Design a protein around this ligand. Sequence first.
Ligand SMILES: CCCCCCCCOCCOCCOCCOCCOCCO
Ligand SMILES: CCCCCCCCOCCOCCOCCOCCOCCO
Lengths: 665, 665, 661
Amino acid sequence: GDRQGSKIRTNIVTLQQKDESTATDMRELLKEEPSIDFGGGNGTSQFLTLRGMGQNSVDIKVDNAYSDSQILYHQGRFIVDPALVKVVSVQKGAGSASAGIGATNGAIIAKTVDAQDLLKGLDKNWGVRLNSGFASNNGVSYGASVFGKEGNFDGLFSYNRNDEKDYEAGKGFRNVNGGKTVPYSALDKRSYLAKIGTTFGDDDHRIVLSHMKDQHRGIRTVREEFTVGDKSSRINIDRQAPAYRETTQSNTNLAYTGKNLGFVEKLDANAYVLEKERYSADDSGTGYAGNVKGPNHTRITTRGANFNFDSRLAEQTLLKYGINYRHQEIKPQAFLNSKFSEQQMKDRADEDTVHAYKLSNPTKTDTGVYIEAIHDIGDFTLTGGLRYDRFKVKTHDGKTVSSSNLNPSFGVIWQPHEHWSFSASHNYASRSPRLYDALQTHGKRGIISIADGTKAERARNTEIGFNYNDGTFAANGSYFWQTIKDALANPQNRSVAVREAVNAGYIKNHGYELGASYRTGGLTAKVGVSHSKPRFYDTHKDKLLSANPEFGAQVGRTWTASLAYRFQNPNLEIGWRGRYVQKATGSILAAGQKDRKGNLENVVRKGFGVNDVFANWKPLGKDTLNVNLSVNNVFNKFYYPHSQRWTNTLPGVGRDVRLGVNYKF
Amino acid sequence: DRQGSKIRTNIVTLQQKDESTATDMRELLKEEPSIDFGGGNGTSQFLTLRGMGQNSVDIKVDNAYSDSQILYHQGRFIVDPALVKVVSVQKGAGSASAGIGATNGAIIAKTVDAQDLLKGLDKNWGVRLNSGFASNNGVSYGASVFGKEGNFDGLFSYNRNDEKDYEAGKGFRNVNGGKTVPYSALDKRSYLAKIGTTFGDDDHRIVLSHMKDQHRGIRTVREEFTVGDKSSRINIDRQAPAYRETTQSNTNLAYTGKNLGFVEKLDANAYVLEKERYSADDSGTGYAGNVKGPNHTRITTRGANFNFDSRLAEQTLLKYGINYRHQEIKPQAFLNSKFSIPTTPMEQQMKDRADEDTVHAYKLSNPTKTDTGVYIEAIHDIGDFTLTGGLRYDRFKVKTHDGKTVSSSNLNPSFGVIWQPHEHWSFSASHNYASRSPRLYDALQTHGKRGIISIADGTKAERARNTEIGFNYNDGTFAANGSYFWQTIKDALANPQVREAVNAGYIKNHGYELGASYRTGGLTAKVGVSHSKPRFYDTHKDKLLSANPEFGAQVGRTWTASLAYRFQNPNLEIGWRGRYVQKATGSILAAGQKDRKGNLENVVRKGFGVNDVFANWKPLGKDTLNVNLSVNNVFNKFYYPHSQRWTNTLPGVGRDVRLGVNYKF
Amino acid sequence: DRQGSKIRTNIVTLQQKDESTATDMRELLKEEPSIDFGGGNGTSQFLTLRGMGQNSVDIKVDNAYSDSQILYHQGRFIVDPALVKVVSVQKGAGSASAGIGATNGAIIAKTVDAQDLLKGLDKNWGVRLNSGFASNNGVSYGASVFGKEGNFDGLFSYNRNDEKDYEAGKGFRNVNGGKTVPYSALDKRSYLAKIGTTFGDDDHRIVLSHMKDQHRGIRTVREEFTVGDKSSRINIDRQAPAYRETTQSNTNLAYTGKNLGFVEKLDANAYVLEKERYSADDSGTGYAGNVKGPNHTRITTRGANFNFDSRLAEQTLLKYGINYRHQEIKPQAFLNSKFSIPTPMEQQMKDRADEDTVHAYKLSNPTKTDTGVYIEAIHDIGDFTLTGGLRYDRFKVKTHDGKTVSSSNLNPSFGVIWQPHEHWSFSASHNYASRSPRLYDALQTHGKRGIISIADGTKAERARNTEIGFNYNDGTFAANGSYFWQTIKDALANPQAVREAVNAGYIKNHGYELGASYRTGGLTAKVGVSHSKPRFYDTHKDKLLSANPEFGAQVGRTWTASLAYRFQNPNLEIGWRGRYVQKATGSILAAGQKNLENVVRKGFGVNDVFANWKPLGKDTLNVNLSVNNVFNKFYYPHSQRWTNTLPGVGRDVRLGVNYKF
Ligand SMILES: CCCCCCCCOCCOCCOCCOCCOCCO
Ligand SMILES: CCCCCCCCOCCOCCOCCOCCOCCO
């Protein structure tokens, strides 16, 4: 099983569990997980943090494809729709050698659903699955899926839609027209999956071809992390200029797995193309896009491939080795550059420089080779590995800078008794600079480059853990220490017309997680707690590190608990679930954060509890029909989650009563 | 049905509807002489019952209904008959169990169910496909899947009707000199999703339902008009056509329990009904505040109804229950601050300048209206008399967009007698009181850019006093019915008095309806005639009632007739149908209506007659396959219907040849 | 087929199309040397046949076709092959039964039917799913449901093809220095709805059918160009991209009765064809009158055809029938009143009197009515088949000023086929046909730029097409050849404040086509070449004929070939396909196009490799892999303007799957 205490949590959500839930986003789906925290709002209003660390350092992997770029820092990076997914797992902090590219701070890892998963409940080779959803606060959802198998072939198509209105925050929230809803938080969210696959050669070989699309549309504000405030605020209707928007994530993926190949005992490979888009119907009121009148379209394309081989050197020792490749390219619609604008000469001088550049699409190439030995001796499992990682960054001025890193990793698990493991690991990993914001790449605000020696961030993550499980009771614990050198955030002047990415500091993180469960005769009891302390230490004279929630947030210590009971007759689980986040204090920046004026901020944030009760009934006895009812945020709590800025941005959803149905025939 | 012609239950049956070629209520209910629809597609249409408009008459689907509107230049939304299984009608003030607002009657529809679709089939699941062509000018299709497992049942239906600009009858010429009515094309879609359980000896049922009904296309600001000459008020610039979606959605939870002791039967309903207007650009829409780019306007209607039947004795039933409805209108944004009165002269701009300040100073909230009623009704059979007594207590509460709140309440008695002396005869009389609360202002004007719309301090509900008599003859071959009615309605409200909603006068209506039918060996013959005379008497100094079609129309005496013959081999029915409306004369306003420049309008409306031939064949003898052929408006008559404005707005559909197949397996 | 190469029936089969990865006609018909398509996506494309453009060549689906256009800066709409079950081609002037306007030929397509989809299945209903992936750069999918109960049948197909800006071949650079062609992305959707009945000993059939084909995306004013440098006439401002939908719809009622006695066969068709352009904002569109906000422009085409075959004797068939078509263009609004000539004085005064006249016109939707009656006798004697025919064609044009002008024509046709041996045919035909004036551009009909009328005597174009051919086929080897000569009198192009459609010259064309094939046990080899020479000759003093690609292009001599092997086990065909077009020279204008242009168009080759696999052996599952333009060749095709408009798609790797159950 999982034996690194709490640092690798495999299959946190299973498809069969997910079908008993009423959630239609990751935020509600992973709320029992204390180290994970989502900001408020719909879609890409949301930021995610893991052990306090943001999506600058934590990735969401679906079918083993992931970008590390972003569209705009006033919104978070795209979070996949769980309707597509069959499993979610998590890996925290710096990973081992087989972990892939950029594993400094960890990842949400998801696999899309397959034909065999959907056929599960049925006694035949094809099937249909319908679902619908109703939410009082305030949405409607449905989907369908058709799937099957003939000879050595299988396939599926799933369409899902979730049409969500402006959500009502908890009690006491008032929106400036004096309503209870959060302006421009409506989103029409659609996804599809198309898969075809073949399994051949004694079932030891499989090729799967997959296309996924995940899309959000609606009238959204420039800056999705805020709504519209009072006309006297910086977040008023004019500055925030809502306009129709679509933001999309698409992935075509080819995947192969072979087993018992003689020359190797298992091989996994993946080649994909991931597209991230922003489309806006009018960008006149969008400063960041260069105020581009009418439709505007921004792309990020990610091409990747991974190969992974497992070779057995002896009954007790496995050798994993492989290679990762990823290329990312950002495409503005048009470069804007030529439009960039008593001793101002120095400025006309600057003006003439920007105009003089001829800009190209920025790219970034990451590649890595790795080996890992996993050796079992006595009731110890020892893991040794190494990665060699290089990147190359070509910014929009054509400037190219690369570097490379050698990253060792060591891990021990000890399992003395059959109910016990204990763990320790010491993992190094590196993470290449990120390209600037895709939406700002047109270069209208000046040129964004990279300094000559700039290098990758490099993490040294040490941690210990234990797992207990005796079949009734379970528990796990993790303590971790993280240092990351050469952190990069905002660019340095070389006057503010031309700037360069630079290493600018270091990062500390440390903390703990506990979890326990109790299982008997239909009763399922659970508790968990997590606290961590991300800190960003400026090292550069112009202090360029950032408290942008993308990097992290100092989240309150977080408790979660659940209590559920499953009746033998009728087949019905009812239960309660709560999440309590304590009061939090302090910026992620050790020197503190400022305020557009430049003034110290006394970052404080309130604790709050959210409580939910739910029910799953299975009127037919099988998992072919699920009727689910939930009432989330029972007490209609008014609150702001912690992973976002601390000023009063976007509250949690007020109370919400949901009825979902899925049905398989 | 024994109130002569005042309650017509099941005017349209599903099995009849499958033999028809109609795709809207207007064509479906054309044999009904008291019902009249204005010209044009979708919400261009106004409906009148006994000459009374959608201000006083509601369409109820699954016992959910709003009384609000989007904009007075269009009619209120008329459900797609593709969704429905039955249509019924109740005219004038209803009895106590009728629900909220029953002063003038209602079209009442129920959506289709699993058991209705399984009708023709000898199994527990099925599919239904349909297809339609219309020469003038459209194409339609749909599919439906439905079934039953254990105590469960469900269905999904999709229907689409893609209609082009229609050609009017002969001699119509459109201003480019074409024969089609500009911007009358609509792409009309509907869905139904339902899931239900029947349990407990078949005496209990819970059904959960979602319906969506949507029209899209390039439509004019003001759908009651097309585009006229560039010299008219209805020219291309003023009418500024643009893409639009207008939508009716309902999620509905319905419960019925039977044989529960003291309660012989219980019916209950809780629902959320959404009405929406979406426009892709509202720059040329004055009424929306000339809002540039996309614009959404919402009306949300939450309701619940509970209804109990208790049996006090074998001949007496007691009905009692409670109705609750909350309506809330949501503009996309209040506009308030941009209130502006042009100079254009005149030299009394003074007070203007003042009013401009008045208006910018408000803070506006979404208007709401809450209606609630408790009622009791006894139905007593003695000798060959059936007596009905009832009472309703109704209250409302109106919160306008300035936050002002005004309520009132009413106690509404109702008495009804049916006498059935012979088995072929009934005679009837009723004396029914009912009330109807003020309507909220137009949803699309709620933003307040044209000024503040409030409600005066003592304003109260309209109150109807409807007396009527009737008879029903039926001997198995020959049938007939007749109704005479008289209607007084006190405290009529129309245009506001910052302006406020006030009571401004009273309404009269009287008239009659006769019908008769003749059925014997294959032949079926029918006739019907109806005439009413709605009159609106001003009481206020500013004359404040309105000749808007919403309120009503003086419609010509209307005759309908049909003759059809069902052959036995093939199973084929061929028939003629005709509808003839005589010339009508006045305004609905007793003192006369005035034309923009304030002059009295000499309201005159031509008579016309429309003839239709149709055929229904059943190639297999069962009802599981219908092939329907029709030609409507055979003589390609050019005319204007009466329920709309009298100037020449939107003509009837010219001649139209239609083919429709439905098939169920 | 026995007219050498002039009539190619069933060039594309449904069964073949299912093994292909192509999602447009251009890639589907690339092995056809006489057909050439311009560069770009959707209506950026021009078609030529024997060097003749869409001004004279039609696309007929289910025997319905318009001859009107939206705007001359884009080509006429080309149907999506996802709808079709067959494509066929008829070149030059047709015989009498060919329909209206058959001066220069037509691509001919039939939409798919229930029986075609049921093909591989052993039951009365079925589903078909498909998906596509394209590296450069798109994704596609669709679904179809279909069946049969008693005497009746029906189908619904939906198809969608979401295409990104395409990357051109190597060395192309776009002005932001990318490799993609700006605004060449299109979201392309089609659906088909059909219901039919077959009755009366299977000798009678009625089919009702509705089809819609639609392209949407951000597109430029003038789709034949992208966006060039800000110093060019094709810069971002002039080209003002904006959201656009362009749509072809057809509702069709079709009847066929057989062996009805005297009448051996009857085919009839009555249909309504809609062509539509919708734009979200036309402010930067000069041609639409700079109409602010949404704008939509329509062309409606109502037609009917009736065709009878009567057998006068075992050896002689008589065909006769009648063709009717009405076309009406509808602007959103006439604009007429705002005509304005920019500000010498002596011309100014003329100018200001001009706008007064324009402003006095009250304008109506232009219409055109075409009708024709025909008879053809087909007579078989010895090993000769002789064909004699006659058409009488009239038209009536009502332009936007209400002016009406008609003419009529009597068009004879003669054809001989001689089949001396069973492996041999030889052919000749001498066919006259006429083609009525086309209405001005739909999108310009508003008349803001002035009034567009028709001169008093103007008449139809009239083609005299003579040609010879041969067909060899012995079961293993096959070859065909065609030579043709075309003269067309009274060509019309550009108008003579108030301007007038006129006859302004003539057109000549000649050339050849040759094909050859070789088929032996799984192996299939094919080659072809085609060369033609369209030439427009001004007759009018103001030189009025046009070099726009609508009318044609001097394409380079074109070679195609392919080589494929089909293995028995697995059921896999792999092959190669080439299309090389030689360098070209010259205008279609005999006197040259203008400031005189020396027209030169470079040659190029395109190579593709492809595989089709049937993992189940039935035709119910096809897995398709192709790589088109393997060597990533950078080029401009010839059926477009010679300047450097829109290049060939670069290299593109595709996988497509269809499955039937
Ligand atoms: C618009 C983007 C969203 C749609 C996603 C689909 C796009 C196309 O993707 C291609 C990937 O292939 C999926 C294969 O599905 C087609 C084959 O159907 C299944 C037949 O195989 C079952 C064999 O028993
Ligand atoms: C200018 C006039 C000529 C126009 C002709 C165009 C006609 C358009 O045809 C297609 C649309 O048809 C829709 C109406 O459907 C009529 C159905 O009649 C068919 C009878 O079939 C009997 C079944 O046994």
